[PDB]
Amino acid sequence: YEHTAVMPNKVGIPYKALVERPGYAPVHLQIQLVNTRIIPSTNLEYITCKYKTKVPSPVVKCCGATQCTSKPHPDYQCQVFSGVYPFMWGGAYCFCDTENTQMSEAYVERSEECSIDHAKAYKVHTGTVQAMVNITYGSVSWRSADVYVNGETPAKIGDAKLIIGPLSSAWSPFDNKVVVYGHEVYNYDFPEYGTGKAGSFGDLQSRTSTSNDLYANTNLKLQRPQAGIVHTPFTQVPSGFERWKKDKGAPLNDVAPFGCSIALEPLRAENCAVGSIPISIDIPDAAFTRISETPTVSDLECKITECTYAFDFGGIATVAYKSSKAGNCPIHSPSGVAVIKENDVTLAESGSFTFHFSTANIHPAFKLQVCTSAVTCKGDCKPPKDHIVDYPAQHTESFTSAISATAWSWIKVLVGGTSAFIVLGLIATAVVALVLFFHRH
């Protein structure tokens, strides 16, 4: 048999159903989703790091003047300073007064820290989504399997076919431009190759970690070596990595909505609790059992013994059952009004057992099916007196949950009063319209 459903893309909440293929006992299905791995296809655009400016040795040609070519180097400068009198230890280093050459070659290249740290910039695409799922059916124990989230992939979890249809919403935390740094990512636009703004982010732009081309753009300028001391004084803007670290934004993982955590080595956002998932699970037929074998259960009476609409299962109730023979039953409420803690109850004759449940409505009306039977029970729940707790919401709230059955009475009597007053008017207009107009005649 095939069972299809839909499920909250929630991370700790189990999803409980009963498959019902007729003529067999209902069989209890549990799906638990333990991570949500949304894997975006990415391409590394360029990497970046602190620059380092290598100033090769200057050329000091004494009398006369050399000229220097534009050798291909990132952000290369070479300027000849005429009128130099470089004055070293043990003599000045040149025999001319003026008309001497100080060539002042400067050149900028990737620092060695780039090997260990680098804010590599990607370009995010739609990619694929997958998840690790945990199933429990019948008396078979827990069976876990990773699964591609797309309808077109069998993903055989054990002995059953699980097809997980494409995620209801296509939201992704990542925009098209992302930059990964260390253990985190940033939803930052990056001035891409060769558009480097000369001082904020893209001072260096290296196509890969070990690339021979480097689009330095750092606004290197060279100055006159003062007072005849040999050196190549170079003035230029500080590193873009400096200012990007200082004025770094909040990391995406600290801003990503829907409780989305981020991991790195696939650049994946986990535990991303958006929308819902369709499910289509084709269970083995062998796990079923003929209804004629199944016990009859009858004269069911369930009473809520104490409930309080807490997140955790803060309602206890009791069901008095009478039985045909020893055996197992699944108990789940077919409707979202309650979630039942207990998967299965394996049951003797003529007895009264207790089940825990969680709910937020202030008069729950669960219709709970024990062993292909039915029983409906309701009662008051009270506010569970803690304010903030750390257990996520086991139940799903619906709008018609908070109305306290006097407020329900109050709005009912109010709406009835308006409607009946207008109806009284309508009847009065009709009866005067006829008794007084047409009967006098």
């Binding site: 600290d254 801003v255 909505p257 829907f258 409780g259 304010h387």
Partner: protein
């Protein structure tokens, strides 16, 4: 090796959480809702402060 700021003194009121913080060193506190709107909040705390 990094430092651990003293664990915040935490106490609850109705739908609000109130952290008394006593940073010995300047400390970064980030908060983010897990709903549709992240509503991030990121501030550095130098002196002992309370925050709601």
């Amino acid at each position: 090796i990094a430092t651990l700021a003293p664990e915040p003194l935490v106490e609850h009121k109705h739908r609000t959480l109130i952290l008394h913080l006593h940073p010995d060193h300047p400390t970064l506190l980030t908060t983010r809702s897990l709903g549709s709107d992240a509503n991030p909040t990121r501030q550095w705390i130098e002196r002992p402060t309370t925050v709601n």
